[PDB]
Symmetry: D2
């Protein structure tokens, strides 16, 4: 059975990234299901620490540790064992009363805070990975389009000539600062609250640094009230998701206007478009509009989380709103979809140039030329060139057909003076590619200038990957250190 939506002009199959937008909602875990594997990690690291502190004997330790493995297996199919006390009770039924001792010096409150941090921690790197791939496809696309002349818009009106490469490097700079936000958020997420217990700590002499290290955290949430009542990192995670996706919505909306029947300066790859069940001509931007949908929805968690913090005291509280897996999954699906939209986007290079040359986006350079050649001030030249456009439209003369005749008519009709410029000065001022080449300062569409943007972005991307690789390896090292600590206590007992 094929994909029944691939009919008419919806040829071939949905690109996999496009398909993600249809799958994430039904496939997303509940928060309980997504966090409960991290709870089992906290159990292991927490009783290991209890053992090294002489709160548990090695016998008690190994009995518990080996029991956790069994219950984890039961929990893979028994949904009811994915919250703490049911899990603790099942451990009691499996290894005896000693199970109770894994909760010494600990609460559900700091267990939850730490476990949810670990979940968001991993989802953050998953996001940074997706945003990097988004930026990679964007920069890489720019590299192939240093000569693709097109108009840039302001207020949805043709403004001035640029190149597609120049435009995409605006996205790259946007994504660079969003990657900064995510890395800055990571440092505030990756702090361990374990040891706070209910909110005030405990008399049992725990080693809070050891539990934190064993679980991959880079530091402690020191104060014990902050440990269970702190939630700003959840709010901030929701925010960056929303602000980043707003930038993604804007790109999707930009490409959607490019790919209108009326602009047609770009076309979505068949694998990122759908069609209508009634209208055979449709090539619909389903990828774009469902990506925007995810960006609009991401404001929900943000508002819910902040409402909840504004509604309580600075306590642990069960009334706080969470950032849900399904919300992150939507972000990932949309980032992936737009990563593939950018990569496979088909610009109509020729109609792009036509617009740049015919639709008067070159009138600024005409104005600048008068100022630079005869020395009149900008505001007066502006009025001359403005009336040139008024006249050219009335008479049906496209920008690239405007001549010395018309510029003199306007200068006279608007000032009584003629003006000292050749037909060559004008022709060159109205050349869209010459508009591009003259804009060669830092951050401007000239190829030499955009290539410099790309060179810096490539180096920043190299550094982005290095940061991600280091943060991932840190967590894997600590996850292995903890696995080894457990095996050793299980072996130490069995052999003595």
């Amino acid at each position: 059975v094929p994909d029944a939506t691939r009919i008419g002009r919806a040829t071939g199959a949905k690109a996999p990234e496009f398909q993600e937008l249809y799958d994430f909602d039904a496939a997303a875990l509940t928060l309980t299901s997504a966090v409960f594997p991290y709870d089992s990690q906290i159990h292991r690291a927490h009783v290991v620490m209890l053992t090294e502190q002489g709160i548990l004997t090695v016998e008690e330790s190994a009995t518990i540790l080996s029991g956790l493995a069994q219950v984890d297996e039961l929990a893979a199919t028994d949904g009811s064992l994915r919250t703490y006390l049911p899990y603790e009770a099942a451990l009691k039924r499996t290894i005896g009363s000693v199970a109770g001792k894994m909760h010494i010096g600990r609460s559900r409150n700091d267990l939850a805070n730490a476990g949810k941090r670990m979940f968001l921690r991993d989802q953050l790197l998953r996001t940074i990975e997706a945003v990097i791939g988004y930026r990679e496809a964007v920069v890489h696309k720019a590299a192939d389009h240093l000569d693709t002349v097109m108009v840039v818009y302001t207020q949805r009106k043709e403004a001035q000539p640029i190149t597609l490469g120049h435009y995409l490097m605006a996205i790259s700079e946007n994504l660079a600062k969003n990657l900064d936000r995510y890395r800055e958020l990571y440092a505030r997420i990756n702090l361990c609250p374990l040891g706070a217990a209910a909110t005030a700590g405990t008399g049992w002499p725990l080693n809070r640094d050891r539990t934190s290290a064993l679980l991959g955290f880079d530091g402690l949430v020191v104060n014990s009230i902050e440990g269970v009542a702190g939630w700003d990192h959840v709010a901030e995670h929701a925010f960056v998701n929303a602000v980043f996706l707003s930038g993604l919505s804007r790109l999707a909306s930009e490409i959607q206007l490019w790919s209108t029947d009326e602009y047609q300066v770009a076309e979505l790859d068949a694998s990122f478009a759908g069609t209508s069940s009634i209208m055979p001509q449709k090539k619909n931007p389903d990828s774009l509009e469902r990506s925007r949908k995810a960006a609009f929805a991401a404001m929900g968690p943000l508002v819910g989380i902040l409402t909840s913090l504004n509604a309580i005291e600075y306590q642990y509280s069960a009334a706080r709103v969470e950032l849900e897996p399904r919300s992150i999954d939507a972000l990932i699906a949309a980032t992936h979809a737009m990563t593939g939209v950018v990569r496979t986007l088909h610009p109509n290079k020729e109609r792009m140039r036509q617009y740049a040359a015919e639709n008067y986006s070159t009138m600024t350079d005409l104005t600048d030329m008068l100022v630079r050649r005869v020395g009149i001030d900008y505001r007066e030249a502006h009025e001359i060139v403005a009336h040139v456009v008024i006249t050219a439209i009335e008479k049906g003369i496209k920008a690239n057909k405007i001549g010395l005749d018309l510029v003199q008519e306007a200068a006279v009709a608007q000032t009584g003076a003629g003006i000292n410029v050749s037909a060559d000065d004008i022709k060159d001022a109205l050349d869209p590619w010459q508009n591009v080449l003259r804009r060669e300062g830092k951050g401007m569409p000239a190829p030499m200038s955009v290539k410099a943007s790309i060179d810096d972005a490539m180096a920043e991307l190299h550094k982005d990957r290095a940061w991600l690789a280091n943060a991932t390896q840190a967590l894997a090292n600590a996850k292995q250190t903890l696995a080894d600590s457990v095996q050793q206590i299980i072996q130490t007992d069995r052999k003595y």
Copy 2:
């Protein structure tokens, strides 16, 4: 004429910080009025750069520069001269057609983006200053209350014994990370978009680094589209304001419950409370509730800004929502109010201890003691101590009156076993001050532990002030460098 609200129990005058909450709304500038002084700075720095680049002659430069001073003076009283083109026209009426030349290689789009950045830049340091003073008063208050034993709450129910100093240091850690957010936001605000012109740059060979340096920016918004279309720093500024104020709302709500007629573990200073026009007994937390009001309202700008970015393309656009001065002013008033609330808060040290000793918040230490002394597991001891509380309530026995009799009754009625502990073990387990001293790990209420929190916070506060002092001095140096550059071009011309 006195303050007519200072009647009945509202004795003395409103504290100045309390009064701010009543004044900021009517006194706040419009965005136009707050930004237009920064536009005049951009004019000076921009034509200076034009001069150093040989786009303007020194004659033209000095004529413009001296004209700006005159129009700035006209604009101090003429409201209509506070947007660009009216201002440019007034300069035309004052120094002639040369006025037009100050707009060479420039647009309203990058002028606005840069000017608004400069406004938010200054408002950010104003905020960091207020948050520092908020943290100072919080830490300083904690220092004076290492021995003030009281209960901490979870879910608005007495949880465990702590000290007021311990609680306030949770706020300090919250404010430390909010100061991090603000400093991280600052780096993204303090980038100069000038040179982007309409969105694509210009043919005029500007020195974008020189304009940026003259205006105090620490770097460039490189890509020209990002220069006029970038808005995330506005969204982020709204966010941090909201997340920080949510933490302030939670403290205000905490103190408001402390200061209820029913808790009465704290009392607002008379200078931060009001009263009723009908009910003479009222001592109302007007300071607290108006501070919360500002925190709730701060979600508005956040949502409006993000809706607006989600609604457009990645272009310059006049449909984007701003962060308004009145919104920042509310934040400042609320931070100041809570700074004074914390400083002058009057804890009822005695009723605080009474609650800690009588209302069963010490039952965890009773449970931990059974586990540590007879070795039973936590879950079983929990059930014993739980039934102890059930029984003690039925019989009207406060926590500090619970005896060996009752613990044995419960252990028997719940297990058939007695349990091996002296009346001394129990008495000490139920001592609230001993609950505090036993919690001596990192971040726990023990005085030695809280004092360590305070010592680290003092050093972080020292560093916070250093960062602020450096960022302020940087802007003042660049503002003086620009004033000198202008004088020199005005002098150079007049003497040659």
Copy 3:
């Protein structure tokens, strides 16, 4: 295996309404799964109309209709058949090419709009039913507490004496107007957009009134663009959910303060409270705080939906955010939980009176008495009674112990005059029950006055149920009319 959270003071089982708060998230349908049964209804009603219009022959009709029954059965287990085109394709595999003809004069756009309306329609009555039961429990509780004297609060400070019945009737009036909002929303939801097709209608001569009637709608979405682009009813549904839940949050927060260890003027029924895994004394308001959580989260869909409408044109669009089943399910769970909280709430009638008599909430009646007896103006009497409270607190004299001595001291110390009132006048002015009885105007706590509130509410509740019963019966009648129309076309063919 029991509920492992029912330990310590969490005696017995969670009340079923309390349990709902733990089950709704994992049990909620996806929007696709919840809507696809309504699509099959639209298919039947739509081809019936096609048949009555002579667009389909009876042979074609019966073949399709009988095929739908088969595919509906396949779709009960095959998830992929729950979106239109996969469903249409499966019908093609089951009855032949004639399947295609069920889409004549129709689009996915108006199919979706109508189907989602039908889903929200049913969820709206489900909500009105839950809000009625919420109001019933509230009014019924008030009836049993016309004599339960207690303080009302303003700004979380004891204000004046009332009764619990009086308080609950404020909730009743709040819920009455929310029921109005829901009934007003219903009329805007229950309009049929079918016939709009893609957005512009169709040449096929459909009978739009017949399809609308067969599916239970009370009218048409006339204009065809409005039919597929209209979404305000979704926004409004999200809004009423949020505003109603805000009122529910406020009640939950009120009861949570009542039930604090410090107030203890109320206690949650054991079946609506939990406890701590570490602190044995806790009786935690898990029901209340998870109900508030749902209210905070309900702002998310509202913001997402409105962001999405603000981001598009007035077109059909796949970028619009929906109101999800899981969001409604949370509302229902919270309404049910609070319905049971109110019903089983245990007021401590005695400590309620103690507060009313001892904590100075009766000082208004003392003030009013001076004004009514000696004729001084309110503002001066206020200052006398205010200083009475200042003095009484200093000296430790509770309100019900204030005597003629103290009132004369204050009147003298504050004016030099004594004042003409007996010790009986005062004693009666400070009697909290007499404060209640004197407040006998419309909407005031006097029993005769609250009983009148209750009498009107009972009649409004009777009318609320009548409205709901009528709206439900209307849908059931139309659902049966459609079932009969289908059977007849299936019988007509098989017998001819």
Copy 4:
């Protein structure tokens, strides 16, 4: 001095409605300044009622009433007299101690609730008036464009032929239901809370119905807690503003795409457009984008208000967020701007038809024709016509040039079968005006069908005006009844 922005292509003056968008922010009142005139009305109506109830003597009454007139005059210039207690104190300085007696049986709490209701009440009719004028201009524009053939879009892609009149009547139906929302909100606003006093009523025997009638309310907020704690009407007012403005944003965005350089199917009237200070060609949609800006910002108050209700108990509270005058003023400015945009919009009737005839929006009628003539099912015909479009694009053949040749090629290449239709059948199926005429059902673009929409809308508009006229006259009658009651008590005393 002219408007300095009217340069270049920004010819003539800003239309007044366009200018409103620039003036409302700086001109908006504070909430205090906007409400304090309604407080003086409540004072008059409240002491009149006190007099008729024998709580005040006629001497006391007239002294107060005449004093209010004097203080109202002082308050016109003294800003400090615009909150209650300062105002009461000034009355004390003007007529003596009797001033205090105007507060008998009353609080600031119910004074504020009632006064703010009166302010929102008037602002609601102001809004309903503006929305009516918005709908009038929309319907009236439709009437003039029953023959203006153009494409409708779905997902920003040309869908099917319609007329501009048809499109505008979708807006009319949207605005009709928004007018319903506002009228339904009005009934919940126009209820009088006076008599609630602080929250519990009073012993003084007020006539709550008399005060309510004198102030124009149509009923009572009965329960006294609801009187001061009720706020949902504020939330709802913010909501309808946001949902209505979202519909206005969508129209503004639709017209902005119409008026792009690439579509150019419409052009803004010169009086609703601006231009660039750098780019002479720009004709910028400043009216549209600033109207959208107001719609995005309107989500702020909504979120702030609902956060605040979610954060408190069901009490009077000073932490609740208000709906501000400046927020309503923005709505009014935007409604007025779009009212004039619609009225003066210039459709390019000819390019509209060109698109409808050339860009394949007529392929549905081609498909429907095959189904209606040879009897094949829709899905197969769809695939034929789809490949017709694929082929026509490849070969550069516009829709209106597609012939019998091409339809047979596709039918063969896609099925091996030819198909039985004449070149006349095809030509007529591809005629955009014939597409319009065939869509003649209820709510479809056929002139006879749209004219019926217009006829019903005109009658609904007539009824909208009647409702508004009645609600305005009711308030004016009660405002005169109150003015007469005051004069009579002032005359009665002076003559006796």
